[PDB]
Every structure is written in structure tokens, then in C-alpha cells.
């Protein structure tokens, strides 16, 4: 069981950002969900057998 | 079981961003769902046998 | 079971962005759903046998 | 079971954007559904045997 | 079972965009459905045996 | 079972866009359905044996 309630005058929200200037070889990486707001809720569940996930940047051989 | 309620005068929201200037070889990577708003809710469930996910940037052999 | 309710005077929302100037070799990558709004809700469920997902940027041999 | 309700005077929304200037070799990639609005709802279910999905940018041999 | 209800005086919405100037070799890619409006709803289901989906940008041999 | 209902005075909506100026070799790609309006609803189901779907940009052999 989960309950959320709110009352608000003003909200300003910035979730994720990146800046790169003049650089070489740069990575921004986030391995899960991104959830953003004046009210925000997130949930995840994992079960099963051998269930698998991944994320990756640059590769050079 | 989940309940949400909210009341607001004003809201401003910016979810995900990236700036790259003059650079070489740049990656922004996000491995799950993106959810953005004045009110936001997200849910995920995983089960089963051998169930598999992935994401990747540049590759060079 | 899920319930959402809201009341608002004003809302302004920007979900996902990318800016690249004068650069070489750039990637923006997102491995799931994108959901955006003044009210926003997202759900996913995964089961089965051998069920598989993927995403990828540039590749060079 | 899902219930949503909302009341709003004014709303402004931008889902996904991309800008590239004077650049070489740029990729914007999203591996799932894109949903945008003043009110937004999204749902997905995956089952079966060997069910598969994918997405890809530039490829060079 | 899904229920949605909403009331609004004024609404403005922009779904997906891409801008490219003087650039060379650019790709905007989305692997699923695109849904946009003042009220937006989406649903997807996948089952069966060996069922497959895909998407791709430029390819060069 | 799905239910949607709404009342609105004014609404403005733009679904998908692209701008390319002085550029060379550019691709915009969407692997699913496109739905746009003041109210928007979408549904898809996939089953069977060996069922296949696809989409692709420029190819050079």
C-alpha cells in the first residue's frame, strides 16, 4: 500500500544535464529509469531465473 | 495498491538535457525509461526464464 | 490497483533535448520508453522464455 | 485497474528535441515508445518464447 | 481495466523534433510507436513463438 | 475495458517535425505507428509463429 498527497504554490525542476566543451572522449551514463517532476513516484520489481540487464559506453578493439 | 493526489498554482519542468560544443567522441546514454511532468508515476516488473535486455554507444573494431 | 488525481492553474514541460555544435562523432541514446506531460504515467511488465530487447549507436569495422 | 483524473487552466508541453550545427557523424536514438501530452498514459506487456526487439544507428564495414 | 478523465481551458503540445544545419551524416531514430495530444494513451502486448521486430539507420559496405 | 473522457476550450498540437539546411546525408526514422490529435489513443498486439516486422534507412553495397 502506498499513498502520496501534496499542495503547492510554485515548482521549478531540472532532472539530468550534461555539458562538454572542446573535450575529447566523454561519457554520461545512467543505468536505470529517469523520473522527474513537481510530484514524482517510481517502482521496480525483478524475479525469474537468469534474468539479465546491461548498459555500455564507447568500445574500441 | 497505489494512490496519488496533488494541487498546484504553477509548475515548470525540464527532464533530460545535453550540450556538446567543439568536442570529439561524446556519448549520453540512459539504460531505462524516461518519465517527466508536473505529476509523474512510473512502474516496471520483470520475471520469466532467461529474459534479457541491453543498450550500447559507439563500437569500433 | 492505481489511482491518480490532480488540479493545477499553470504547467510548462520539456521532456528530452540534445544540442551539438561544431562537434565530431556524437551519440544521444535512451534504452526505454519516453513519457512526458502535465500528468504522466508509465507501466511495463516482462515474462516468458528467452524474451530479448536491445539498442545500439554507430558501429565501424 | 488504473484510474486517472485531472483539471488544469493552462498547459504547454515539448516531448523530444534534437539540434546539430556544423557537426559530423551525430546519432539520436530511442529504443521504446514515445508518449507526450497535457495528460499522458503508457502501458506495455511482453511474454512468449524467443520474442525479440532491436534498434540501431549508422553501420560501416 | 483503465479509466481516464480530464478538463482544460487551454493546451499547447509539441511531440518530436530534429534540426540539422551544415552537418554531415546525421540520424534521428525511434524504435517504437509515437503518440501525441492534449490527452494521450498508448498500450502494447507481445507474445507468440520467435516473434521479431527491428529498425535501422544508414548502412555502408 | 478502456474509458477516456474530456472537455476543453482551446487546444494546439504539433506531432513530428524535421529541419535540414545545407546538410548532407541525414535520416529521420520511426519504427512504429504515429498518432496525433487533441485526444489520442493507440493499441497494438503481436502473436503467432515466426511473425516478423522491420524498417530501414539508406543502404550502400
UniProtKB/Swiss-Prot annotation, chains A, B, C, D, E, F:
Residues 1-31 are annotated as: 4 X 11 AA tandem repeats of [EGS]-K-T-K-[EQ]-[GQ]-V-X(4). Signal peptide: none annotated. Cu cation binds at residue 14. The modification Phosphoserine is found at residue 51. Changing residue 14 to A: Impairs copper-binding. Phosphorylated, predominantly on serine residues. Phosphorylation by CK1 appears to occur on residues distinct from the residue phosphorylated by other kinases. Changing residue 21 to K: Increases oligomerization. Highly expressed in presynaptic terminals in the central nervous system. Expressed principally in brain. Changing residue 10 to K: In PARK1 and DLB; significant increase in binding to negatively charged phospholipid liposomes; increases oligomerization. The 'non A-beta component of Alzheimer disease amyloid plaque' domain (NAC domain) is involved in fibrils formation. The middle hydrophobic region forms the core of the filaments. The C-terminus may regulate aggregation and determine the diameter of the filaments. Neuronal protein that plays several roles in synaptic activity such as regulation of synaptic vesicle trafficking and subsequent neurotransmitter release. Participates as a monomer in synaptic vesicle exocytosis by enhancing vesicle priming, fusion and dilation of exocytotic fusion pores. Mechanistically, acts by increasing local Ca(2+) release from microdomains which is essential for the enhancement of ATP-induced exocytosis. Belongs to the synuclein family. Soluble monomer. Homotetramer. A dynamic intracellular population of tetramers and monomers coexists normally and the tetramer plays an essential role in maintaining homeostasis. Interacts with UCHL1. Interacts with phospholipase D and histones. Interacts (via N-terminus) with synphilin-1/SNCAIP; this interaction promotes formation of SNCA inclusions in the cytoplasm. Interacts with CALM1. Interacts with STXBP1; this interaction controls SNCA self-replicating aggregation. Interacts with SNARE components VAMP2 and SNAP25; these interactions allows SNARE complex assembly and integrity. It is linked to Genetic alterations of SNCA resulting in aberrant polymerization into fibrils, are associated with several neurodegenerative diseases (synucleinopathies). SNCA fibrillar aggregates represent the major non A-beta component of Alzheimer disease amyloid plaque, and a major component of Lewy body inclusions. They are also found within Lewy body (LB)-like intraneuronal inclusions, glial inclusions and axonal spheroids in neurodegeneration with brain iron accumulation type 1. This is Alpha-synuclein. The gene is SNCA. The chain holds residues 37 to 97 of 140 of the full protein.
